[PDB]
């Protein structure tokens, strides 16, 4: 004879999305990428491994990536908003080729580009000579700026840097982030080993289009991530085992000067170039890249036919962001031509650097929004970077009929792929603490894979985590509302007290009987919740009716006034005179 019992806090998961808040480890640093709305990080104090749990991870549909895209866009816009506008600078420029002193070819396509401009006093004007890159300037020799006819240009504030700073994403109270620690996790499937972690592993916001930079590296081998790799539209993300070191630089002294375009507004421009005019370049070691492409070819050959000829090639077309590797170095935006590193062909089976040309634009329209642009101020002196090419993004040229050759090209344009490469492991799971089980009474997040009864001994800890700008307030208010809903349901069932509560409702055979022997011995709470999920509303309603309405009526004023010596008069009759 087993009847229903109600447990509060049993560990179970619902995959609902939610707003995840900041966690950034702690004056110069405050200028860049930090809104100081972000709490200091605890030193990874709670990483509770969960033993013998199989959770379905799908990197491709997780709300954390979209939330991070919105958050990084908002961070960028907030940084740009209190900075000088360059609407005064949309003027007619008389541009001339940079002075080589003879007819020598101009390198980088720098253009002298004088203009009239304004000053602090409204009446006066000040002729200004400023070298502008040709990609920034468009003809109308009369010349104008590229984005004048479409979008207003907001200068980045001069002191502000853009260097990536790690951001840890931590779920609110009532939701717990689950990390998949499995090596060789291709991103979409069951994860053999799961852990509960409060905060993600300090994801770095780094913006790079073709080749991911400074990301996290795989442990064992290259991993090829793609949903339906047969599909052409879906990008193939590649996580590399070994970093490939890219050494990038602009070799120009770049003498910078400033003018005041208005009251409290300043404009920073390239006054002059002291040294020789030289192209920007990025070096990648040829042997390292050859080995990396060999490893990537092996992992790609696994998915397609083993006989297939895998050929790489330059990007077919698009905007300069898509067509070329984009990235910032020391505050200067580089667009580097990757055709040198992707034109090999691999047929079925040293100390020289592949030098990639690079062109630098000052006017950046990143995130590909309509109607917005930013002027990156020039940076004085020679700039260098030593990035690690930790990941690649590829797309397969499709439409071929038969033939063993597969053409892979660099791809991009959508920056969600960059953050998918780092947030692949993480999932957000809601905690639905309430649960109902059979038992013969008849009156954080650890041990999830542990069988029932083991959970109850630690039950309290889950009940402790619950209950702990506009979206954060909404998150907290919804956490409070969820807690009040759970407590109200617990009270309506008669279980005002938390923890174990026993209730007289007979365990119907219809409610997924299951034999009522292994249920409690050999089985964990999650598989139970999978079983009884459909019947839960009926159980809740029957609990409310049986041990709340009937219990109220049989413990209403009944027994409140108990004086009955002549009780059961319709039986006192039955042996009143019958004895006689």
């Amino acid at each position: 004879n087993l009847w229903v019992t109600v447990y509060y806090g049993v560990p179970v998961w619902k995959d609902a999305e939610t707003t995840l808040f900041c966690a950034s480890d702690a004056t110069e640093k405050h200028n860049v990428w930090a809104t100081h709305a972000c709490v200091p990080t605890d030193p990874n104090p709670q990483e509770i491994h969960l033993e013998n749990v199989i959770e379905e991870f799908n990197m491709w549909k997780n709300n954390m990536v979209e939330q991070m895209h919105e958050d990084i866009i908002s961070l960028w816009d907030q940084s740009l908003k209190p900075c000088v506008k360059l609407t005064p600078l949309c003027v007619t420029l008389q541009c001339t080729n940079v002075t080589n002193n003879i007819t020598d070819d101009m390198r980088g396509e720098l253009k002298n580009c004088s203009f009239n401009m304004t000053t602090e006093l409204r009446d006066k004007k000040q002729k200004v000579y400023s070298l502008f890159y040709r990609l920034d300037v468009v003809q109308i020799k009369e010349y104008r700026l590229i984005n004048c006819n479409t979008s207003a240009i907001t200068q980045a504030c001069p002191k502000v840097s853009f260097e990536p700073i790690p951001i840890h994403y931590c779920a609110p109270a009532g939701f717990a982030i689950l990390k998949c620690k499995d090596k060789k996790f291709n991103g979409t499937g069951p994860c053999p080993s799961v852990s509960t972690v409060q905060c993600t592993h300090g994801i770095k916001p780094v913006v790079s289009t073709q080749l991911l930079l400074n990301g996290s590296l795989a442990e064992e081998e290259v991993i090829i991530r793609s949903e339906n790799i047969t599909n052409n539209a879906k990008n193939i993300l590649v996580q590399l085992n070994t970093p490939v070191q890219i050494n990038c630089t602009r070799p120009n002294n770049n003498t910078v000067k400033s003018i005041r375009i208005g009251p409290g507004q300043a404009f920073y421009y390239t006054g002059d170039i002291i040294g020789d005019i030289r192209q920007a370049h990025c070096n990648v070691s040829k042997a390292t890249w050859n080995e990396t492409l060999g490893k990537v070819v092996k992992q790609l050959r696994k998915h397609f036919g083993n006989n297939t000829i895998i050929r790489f090639a330059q990007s077919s077309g698009g905007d300069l962001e898509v067509t070329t590797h984009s990235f910032n170095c020391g505050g200067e935006f580089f667009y580097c031509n990757t055709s040198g590193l992707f034109n090999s062909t691999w047929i079925s089976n040293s100390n020289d650097s592949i030098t990639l040309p690079c062109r630098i634009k000052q006017i950046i329209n990143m995130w590909q929004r309509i109607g917005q642009a930013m002027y990156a101020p020039p940076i004085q002196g020679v700039i260098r970077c030593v990035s690690n090419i930790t990941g690649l993004i590829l797309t397969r040229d499709g439409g071929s009929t038969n033939s063993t050759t597969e053409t892979f090209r660099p791809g991009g344009g959508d920056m969600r792929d960059n953050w998918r490469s780092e947030l692949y492991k993480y999932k957000v799971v809601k905690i639905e603490p309430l649960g109902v089980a059979p038992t013969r009474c008849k009156r954080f997040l650890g041990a999830a894979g542990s069988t029932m009864g083991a959970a109850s001994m630690t039950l309290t800890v889950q009940a402790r985590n619950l209950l702990s700008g506009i979206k954060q307030l909404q998150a907290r208010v919804l956490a409070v509302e969820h807690y009040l809903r759970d407590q109200q349901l617990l009270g309506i069932w008669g279980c005002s007290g938390k923890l174990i509560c026993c209730t007289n409702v007979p365990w119907n055979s219809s409610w997924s009987n299951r034999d009522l022997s292994e249920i409690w011995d050999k089985m964990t709470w999650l598989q139970w919740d999978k079983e009884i999920s459909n019947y839960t509303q009926i159980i809740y309603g029957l609990l409310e009716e049986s041990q709340n309405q009937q219990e109220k009526n049989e413990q209403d004023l009944l027994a409140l006034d108990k004086w009955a010596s002549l009780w059961n008069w319709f039986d006192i009759t039955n042996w009143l005179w019958y004895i006689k």
Binding site: N228, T230, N231, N232, G398, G399, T401, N402
Partner: protein, 97 residues
């Protein structure tokens, strides 16, 4: 990579049309209709799911790496050319007459 049969299907009004499609790849198969002189329009996707505005008359179901399009009680708005589609790959098309 994929094909469909029969090439031409000569039926009268009120009869049921059956068109088979053989695929050599895993991937959801959609069926399109082309009225002569108009742009083609999707009639079903995912093998058996109908597009918006398509009547119950159109349906399809099959097992293995084959697909079937069944069209009961042919009407005047039928008698187009019917195309298989997999991941950016089409069949030669069946003309219903």
């Amino acid at each position: 990579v994929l094909t469909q049969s029969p090439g031409t299907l000569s039926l009268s009004p009120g009869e049921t049309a059956i068109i088979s499609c053989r695929t050599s790849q895993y991937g959801s198969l959609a069926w399109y209709q082309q009225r002569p002189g108009q742009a083609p329009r999707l009639v079903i996707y995912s093998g058996s799911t109908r597009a918006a505005g398509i009547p119950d008359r159109f349906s399809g179901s099959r097992w293995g790496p084959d697909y079937n399009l069944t069209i009961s009680n042919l009407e005047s708005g039928d008698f187009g050319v019917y195309y298989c589609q997999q991941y950016e790959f089409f069949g030669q098309g069946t003309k219903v007459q």
